[PDB]
Amino acid sequence: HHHANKEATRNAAALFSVDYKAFLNEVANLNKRMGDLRDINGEAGAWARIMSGTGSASGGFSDNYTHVQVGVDKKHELDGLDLFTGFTVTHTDSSASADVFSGKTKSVGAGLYASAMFDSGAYIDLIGKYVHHDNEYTATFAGLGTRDYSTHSWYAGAEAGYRYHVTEDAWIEPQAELVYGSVSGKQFAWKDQGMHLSMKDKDYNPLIGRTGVDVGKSFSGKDWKVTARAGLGYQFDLLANGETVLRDASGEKRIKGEKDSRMLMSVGLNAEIRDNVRFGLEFEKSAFGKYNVDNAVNANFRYSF
Ligand SMILES: CCCCCCCCOCCOCCOCCOCCO
Numbered sequence: 048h049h050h051a052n053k054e055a056t057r058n059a060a061a062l063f064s065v066d067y068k069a070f071l072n073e074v075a076n077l078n079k080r081m082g083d084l085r086d087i088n089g090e091a092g093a094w095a096r097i098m099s100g101t102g103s104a105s106g107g108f109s110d111n112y113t114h115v116q117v118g119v120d121k122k123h124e125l126d127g128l129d130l131f132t133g134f135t136v137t138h139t140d141s142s143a144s145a146d147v148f149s150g151k152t153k154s155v156g157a158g159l160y161a162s163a164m165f166d167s168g169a170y171i172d173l174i175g176k177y178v179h180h181d182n183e184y185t186a187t188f189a190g191l192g193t194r195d196y197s198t199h200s201w202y203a204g205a206e207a208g209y210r211y212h213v214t215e216d217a218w219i220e221p222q223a224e225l226v227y228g229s230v231s232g233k234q235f236a237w238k239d240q241g242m243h244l245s246m247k248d249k250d251y252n253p254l255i256g257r258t259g260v261d262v263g264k265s266f267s268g269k270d271w272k273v274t275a276r277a278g279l280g281y282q283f284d285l286l287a288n289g290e291t292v293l294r295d296a297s298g299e300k301r302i303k304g305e306k307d308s309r310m311l312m313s314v315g316l317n318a319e320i321r322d323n324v325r326f327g328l329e330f331e332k333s334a335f336g337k338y339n340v341d342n343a344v345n346a347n348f349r350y351s352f
Pocket residue numbers: 091092119120121132133134159160161173174175203204205
């Protein structure tokens with residue numbers, strides 16, 4: 048009976064954990080979202096982004112996702128400060144698998160951002176958005192079967208960093224980011240072998256921090272620039288306020304959320320072609336987490352005019 052409860056707990060937690068990965072997948076940063084916004088002349092901008100990636104965690108859990116996003120903004124020219132304010136919309140397709148389940152998630156989001164680029168090299172990036180998730184998951188345990196459900200998430204993120212130039216062409220940039228969010232809970236109630244089974248979790252609020260450093264070496268000519276860059280960071284949960292409750296004829300088991308953290312690694316470039324076009328590309332992965340990004344690639348394109 049202990050073994051049964053252990054397995055049930057492990058499985059319920061695995062299945063419900065996908066809502067948290069769905070949330071984590073929508074978390075980016077200034078460079079990953081917008082590319083390089085320094086020294087841009089155009090007073091308006093249109094941009095697109097695509098990300099594709101895969102991750103894993105124990106229990107044979109693995110997922111992969113394709114994230115697509117666009118935005119438009121106006122750039123306000125202030126005294127030593129460019130301030131980009133704009134709108135954004137996103138789409139995500141995810142699939143997930145573990146030993147005991149598999150399924151998919153379709154997401155649609157919309158948000159608002161302000162990005163402040165200071166001549167001094169300082170920057171601040173603020174974003175808030177809402178994401179809707181349609182979910183379809185099939186479980187191989189407990190006769191739970193196929194389950195469709197909606198969730199939605201709010202995001203409020205703030206990021207600051209500082210680009211210190213070691214030389215005219217090389218630079219170092221410490222960064223810190225905090226992202227506060229919400230994840231709607233859901234319930235499954237069903238019968239198996241003529242017994243009433245329940246599995247439910249509550250609304251919770253992720254709070255994800257990151258601290259890291261980026262480094263870059265740039266090259267250019269009259270009408271182009273290319274920056275090679277690499278990143279090392281630390282991404283961590285500050286809260287784990289979720290809880291799954293497994294109810295049963297014999298009683299309830301409560302399963303509290305666990306914090307997880309991981310080391311982020313990235314390598315990439317930012318390109319400038321003439322006056323309107325920018326392009327950003329990076330390869331990334333993480334290590335040491337219970338969940339890790341095993342690999343993902345991010346591309347963006349900004350047209351400034
Ligand atoms: C921590 C959450 C705070 C979120 C910051 C939001 C405040 C800044 O948002 C301003 C958005 O305004 C959009 C500007 O209008 C868009 C014009 O661009 C379209 C025309 O090309």
